[PDB]
Amino acid sequence: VIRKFTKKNVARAKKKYTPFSKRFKSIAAIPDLTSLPEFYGNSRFENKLKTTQKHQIVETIFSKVKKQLNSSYLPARENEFASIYLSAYSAIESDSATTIYVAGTPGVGKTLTVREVVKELLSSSAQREIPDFLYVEINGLKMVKPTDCYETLWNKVSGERLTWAASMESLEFYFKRVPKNKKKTIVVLLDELDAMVTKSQDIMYNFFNWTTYENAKLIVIAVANTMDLPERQLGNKITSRIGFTRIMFTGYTHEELKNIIDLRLKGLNDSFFYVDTKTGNAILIDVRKVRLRMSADAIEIASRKVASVSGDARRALKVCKRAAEIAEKHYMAKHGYGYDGVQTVHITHVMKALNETLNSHVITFMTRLSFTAKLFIYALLNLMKKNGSQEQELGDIVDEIKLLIEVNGSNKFVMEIAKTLFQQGSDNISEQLRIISWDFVLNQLLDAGILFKQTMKNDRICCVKLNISVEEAKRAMNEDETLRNL
Amino acid sequence: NVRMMLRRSMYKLYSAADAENDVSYDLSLVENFKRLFGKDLAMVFNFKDVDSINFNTLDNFIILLKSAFKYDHVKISLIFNINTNLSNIEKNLRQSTIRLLKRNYHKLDVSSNKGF
Amino acid sequence: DPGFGSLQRRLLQQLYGTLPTDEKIIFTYLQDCQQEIDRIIKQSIIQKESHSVILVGPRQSYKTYLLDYELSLLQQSYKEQFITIRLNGFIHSEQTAINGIATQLEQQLQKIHTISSGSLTEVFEKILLLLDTKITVVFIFDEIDTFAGPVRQTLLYNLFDMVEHSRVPVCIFGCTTKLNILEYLEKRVKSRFSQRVIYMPQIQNLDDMVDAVRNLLTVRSEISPWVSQWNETLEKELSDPRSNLNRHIRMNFETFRSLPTLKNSIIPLVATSKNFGSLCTAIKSCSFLDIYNKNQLSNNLTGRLQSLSDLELAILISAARVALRAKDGSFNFNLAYAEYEKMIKAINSRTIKLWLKKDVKNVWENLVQLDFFTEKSAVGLRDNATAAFYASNYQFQGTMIPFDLRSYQMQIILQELRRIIPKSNMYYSWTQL
Amino acid sequence: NVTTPEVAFREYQTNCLASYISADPDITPSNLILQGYSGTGKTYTLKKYFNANPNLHAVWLEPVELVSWKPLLQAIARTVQYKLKTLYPNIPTTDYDPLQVEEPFLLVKTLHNIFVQYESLQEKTCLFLILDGFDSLQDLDAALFNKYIKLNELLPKDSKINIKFIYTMLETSFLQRYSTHCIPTVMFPRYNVDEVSTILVMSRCGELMEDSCLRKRIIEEDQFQNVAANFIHLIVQAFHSYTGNDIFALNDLIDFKWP
Ligand SMILES: Nc1ncnc2c1ncn2[C@@H]1O[C@H](COP(=O)(O)OP(=O)(O)OP(=O)(O)O)[C@@H](O)[C@H]1O
Ligand SMILES: Nc1ncnc2c1ncn2[C@@H]1O[C@H](COP(=O)(O)OP(=O)(O)OP(=O)(O)O)[C@@H](O)[C@H]1O
Ligand SMILES: Nc1ncnc2c1ncn2[C@@H]1O[C@H](COP(=O)(O)OP(=O)(O)OP(=O)(O)O)[C@@H](O)[C@H]1O
Ligand SMILES: [Mg+2]
Ligand SMILES: [Mg+2]
Ligand SMILES: [Mg+2]
């Protein structure tokens, strides 16, 4: 058979098609799923990434501060912890089904406190105060396809691998018809729910609908970045019909961020260290004893700057880590140390680490361009000063460049550079319609994002706009000693 | 477009050659024709309703088929079903394409009105 | 003699940067940036910290060069401590990046001592099982702006989560030309990013370019008898402020400010020399640089104008006259021919053969083909393959009307033709209205 | 270590070709562009250079026959495999299916799998992939050439076989879209009337003087070359204003008006 096209790289998973409604003859024929070694979960790739080191690492006194300010390593989230914990505990002890929607901006401690509530629930179930439950964590931004959540959750429930539609019918039949005495309670963390709802609202409506079933024994914790995601993905009738718990996560204040930072630094500040003077390795208590500190006002202004802009813990922790890294860079450069009295992280280190975030490189990039690129930007600024359109044709820029060269003939620099600009300093080269490196600087300003150019194959009538603002361009061209006097 | 013309032409060519291992439906089927099937190739293109095909596409397809002239086992014949007249056709084709088509062409009045 | 061949080969390998790592040339104005990059990699492969950092700079600003030199520096001392996964934003799509990561992981783990088997869901789950002392995984992401699209930024989210939370040491080097790269990221992605942005250092003064040329062309190993004399000839030409070499370096500094642009001209100056005296004469004169610069401009709108015939030039001038008189700059074949025929009639009244319409059609097609004319409001060459596919299935209105009625616009205006056409040409007086 | 042949008005282009194209991969650029309009002798000069250096390993692809990007990738994989097994017949290789290449990443993977089985070679070699007419591709989006510039970065640098790309393109504006990449580019400017006349004489006088109609005319009733050259200059003097500097159009007019 002669084919019209070929698909030669099809890789298909060995996933079955038959849903759970056909695994048994009747609803009364289903055994105890808790007493089954494939149900409810009743990582071999670590040794791939393993090797042996030859030389010992020199662990500098600041590397403790850097390692201990990582996001991988619950002050201020007590009402949220209490609310999620009492909703989940009350629904678990009553063998009911509930759903808690948690919203907020990134980095405010949403996933962390939901996980801490879940571990506290697991510890209480270890003391047999509440019945046992399965914990499933489903992240919408960790998927190839949004329907794979259906494949994931059922695989955590039954242990078998199905396709997503059959998994959806299996989960529907599990939460609807399977009796409560033959099943276990399930707590689902639906993180990044906006990643799974972009195409359509099937996953949102299915997961919220399963908690309305009397047989479900299902706890769904759904975490998102906007508050009106259920109100705009489902109607108000549906959201009134489910009745989810609604919890917002406001950004941290500066005092809360400060307590977070020095609770990360509780055992390290104002502490002693035995430091090897020839290598720089430090051991927490030929050897010098060095005290280490971070000042209070540095953390204070860092947490004050973060709480004004974003209020998230990740930025505050990362500027503290960057300040410690800057201090350790200067320390290692001063003492000549390698990789294999009082040491302080100062206010100026936090200032510099914040200034790398605060400042922009647009003006600095534009002041170090060539004369032709600055000529292009100056001609563009002259054109938007004259006709006031904010989009200029490229031919108008060419004519404005030609006019600026022709007018300033008495200037020493323009007289010295015009032969370069229109003949590349050579008498065998004819006078060109464009300047030398015209398309080079046009492509460079388009690649940098300074410019925007429309898609048009006529090079004269094609339009170009500044993609930054007019004031950084004015500040850049007034820095140049050539452009600012003409 | 020219891509669909070439893909349909090479699918029909490969199907007709197989009728009496998959391949790419492009002009490398033409250059590899004697390596696969062992015999020489004579393609006869019949363009139906030439007054209806977009002439830029047809010009680019003729320029595409010009690339097969460097293969010694290929000859190409073109049949144009002209409905209006020949002067209306050559005013829509580019002059280099007309110079290409001028080397050997034959006109044939195929109307039922001719001679009654 | 083999000595000049050895010296020419050494100059060519120094210009292409294909020396070994111990002999590799690093420019002074780059060195601090190199040291900063040298810090971050040394905090990942040796000290097992996790880093994410984006290098921002223009094309040919030595991002890939410095990253490759750092990796090949670390490869000769710690080869069992890290693996390298490299992705490119042009080649890898959102689907094929996962397959590329898995394939590169399985070969790089077999180069020290399956993830890539199955569907995309299974492969991505196995990758997250692998990633989300220990071997450092170093990711080199070229054109990282293409994955920071207005679409779910799934891969950047997962890579930055591997940076923050994973027990595997992970170092990401993104590379971009966009100065506002932080605005491209979604909030969750930006929050998970370390906000360590290295802007690549620019050439600030002419002595930076002079020192870089001195670094590129000085042979610092005695592998030829001509090495010392070539070095002192080089130092004499680079020390003279009025030499031809300093003039060309100043010219590049004011126009391109690009050392690779200068290397592309210096390479066939060295490679076309036949002996040592010819090479010394060529570096004294730099006449080959002028010939090179003349060749690089030979197919722009100036050199294409001088290749036209007098009938082609007459049709171009007539079309420019009609386009200048038109309100929107549009013209067609009929208006241009009418202007041309009244122009030949007014010249012959004060002899020139007037060509017919059928012959002027070929000249018109040749002027369209040489990009002197352009179809009105034509987009031209589309940005991406999807837009080109959408355009290729559309039937444009210009392709069905007869050729004499198609609207066209000039890529060169009448004033530019008056600038370029010499005074002795017989159609120069019609470049004014 | 290379031979620079004689091309009649392309001496600078041949010298640049000798300066850039070499059998040693350390002194050879990854990408080389030859830019010129139609009939400027790009194919002629490149063919003369590669036939003057038979030790250079070149693979010729014309992308006007492939139309789209996927057949171009498949043709690259197929022709690279074919050239390697007719170049090294004593190296046992697995014949990879070129139709499995449906993505640029798949081309990278397939080329890596092709090149790892030639590591038994002694010296590092060059594979010259000549994409004669890249911008003659019919679909031709802007983002395609950027995939081919950066293709060598994804392939192993210490491999025995290194792929070198030589691109031929027509339009100046297409080339000027990629000016910041600083790829070495050799320009082929359009010939003048004298150069066109000399090229037409040297390429068509031997075919005109040995034609069947002329030798039938001398029997019905150096100087044959004189009358063929005189016809060529008469055709040029009559029709240079009409054809411009087009070699092909003047060749058609010569072929039409010779009998
Ligand atoms: N209250 C807190 N106490 C201590 N550390 C915190 C706190 N809140 C956040 N952090 C730190 O900041 C990190 C970010 O928190 P988390 O992952 O819970 O944020 P999130 O609100 O879920 O963010 P996103 O929307 O980006 O996923 C945590 O991993 C932790 O290291
Ligand atoms: N691995 C390498 N070995 C030798 N020279 C190299 C290497 N990588 C790049 N170069 C050279 O370094 C110079 C700078 O180009 P490079 O590719 O490093 O810039 P870039 O900023 O990474 O570019 P782009 O943004 O276009 O990817 C060029 O002349 C290039 O040929
Ligand atoms: N320098 C030359 N010496 C002799 N003949 C030449 C020369 N240049 C061109 N020709 C002749 O003109 C023909 C056309 O040249 P060629 O095909 O190389 O041009 P091109 O620029 O590659 O064209 P295109 O853009 O159409 O592919 C050649 O096949 C050859 O017969
Ligand atoms: Mg979270
Ligand atoms: Mg790069
Ligand atoms: Mg050619």
Six-digit token pair at C426? 């017989």
Distance C193 CA to ligand 2 centre (A): 26
Place of tokens 């026959």: D65
| Ligand 3 atom closest to residue D191's alpha carbon, by position in its atom list | 8
A381 Cα to chain D: minimum distance (Å): 24
Neighbouring CB atoms inside 10 A of A290's CB total 16
Regarding beta strands A282-284 and A271-276, do their DSSP bridges make them parallel or antiparallel, or are they unpaired? antiparallel
Phi first, then psi, for residue C298 (nearest 5°) are: -75, -20
Experimental method: cryo-EM
| Non-local CB neighbours of D35 within 8 Å, separated by 6+ positions | C299, D168, D169, D170, D172, D175, D185, D186, D187, D188
What H or E segment, with its residue span, contains residue C66?
helix C63-75
Q: Which domain holds residue D121?
A: 11-188
Helix, strand or coil, per DSSP, at residue A284: strand
Neighbouring CB atoms inside 10 A of D201's CB total 19
How many angstroms separate the CA atoms of A140 and D89, rounded? 52
DSSP per position, A179-243 = -GGGS-EEEEEEESGGGSSSS-SHHHHHHHHHTT-TT--EEEEEEES-SSHHHHHS-HHHHHHH-
Helices (H) and strands (E) in chain B, counts: 6, 2
How many angstroms separate the CA atoms of A218 and A95, rounded? 9
Burial class of residue D84 (count of CB atoms within 10 Å of its CB; 0-12, 13-18, 19+): buried
Q: For residue C256, give the chain D residue with the closest CA.
A: D180
Is residue C384 within 8 A of residue D142, CB to CB? The reply is yes
Q: B11 to chain A: which residues are within 8 Å by CB?
A: 2, 4
How many angstroms separate the CA atoms of C212 and C13, rounded? 15
**Helix extents (H) in A43-109:** 61-67, 78-93
Sheet holding A185-191: strands in order across?
A133-139, A185-191, A218-224, A98-104, A245-249
Place of tokens 């002239």: B69
Q: What is the CATH number of the domain that holds D132?
A: 3.40.50.300
| Non-local CB neighbours of A350 within 8 Å, separated by 6+ positions | A298, A299, A301, A302, A319, A320, A323
**Helix extents (H) in C84-224:** 96-110, 120-130, 154-165, 181-184, 187-192, 206-217
Is residue D143 within 8 A of residue C386, CB to CB? The reply is no
Asked if B102's CB is within 8 angstroms of D256's CB, the reply is yes
Neighbouring CB atoms inside 10 A of D231's CB total 17
List, chain by chain if needed, residues with CB within 6 Å of any ligand 2 atom.
Answer: C 17-18, 57, 59-65, 68, 142, 177, 260
Is residue C9 within 8 A of residue C130, CB to CB? The reply is no
Optimal mutation site among C43, C179, C248, interface A, most CBs of chain A within 10 A: C179
| Resolution of the experimental model, in Å, one decimal | 2.6
Is residue A484 within 8 A of residue A477, CB to CB? The reply is yes
Q: Is A388 annotated as a binding residue?
A: no
Asked if B96's CB is within 8 angstroms of C365's CB, the reply is yes
Is residue D187 within 8 A of residue D36, CB to CB? The reply is yes
- Residue among D65, D98, D139 minimizing CB distance to B3: D139
Asked if C306's CB is within 8 angstroms of A51's CB, the reply is no
How many angstroms separate the CA atoms of A168 and C277, rounded? 81
**Helix extents (H) in A46-163:** 61-67, 78-93, 110-126, 148-157
Regarding beta strands C51-56 and B74-80, do their DSSP bridges make them parallel or antiparallel, or are they unpaired? unpaired
Residues after which chain C has a gap (C–N > 2.5 Å): 113, 132, 350
Starting from the CA of residue C58, give the closest ligand.
2
Cα→Cα distances D41→B116, C260, D116, D199, Å: 54, 28, 37, 10
Which long-range CB contacts under 8 A does C418-427 form with residues at least 24 apart? C419/A431, C419/A433, C420/A430, C420/A431, C420/A433, C420/C302, C420/C305, C421/C305, C421/C313, C425/C313, C426/C310, C426/C347, C426/C352, C427/C310, C427/C313, C427/C314, C427/C317, C427/C343
User: Which of D46, D36, D69 lies closest to D174, judged by CA?
Assistant: D36
Mutation pick for ligand 3 pocket among D33, D38, D43 (CB with most ligand atoms within 8 Å): D43
Q: Is the CB of A251 under 6 A from ligand 1?
A: no
Asked if C381's CB is within 8 angstroms of D140's CB, the reply is yes
Q: Which amino acid is at A145?
A: K
Cα→Cα distances A427→A202, A400, A422, C287, C291, Å: 72, 25, 10, 12, 11
| Residues paired with residue A138 on neighbouring β-strands, in sequence order | A190
CA angle C210–C215–C219, rounded 5-degree value: 130
| Helices A313-335 + A254-264 axis angle, to 10 | 50
Is residue A376 within 8 A of residue A401, CB to CB? The reply is yes
Is residue A425 within 8 A of residue C287, CB to CB? The reply is no
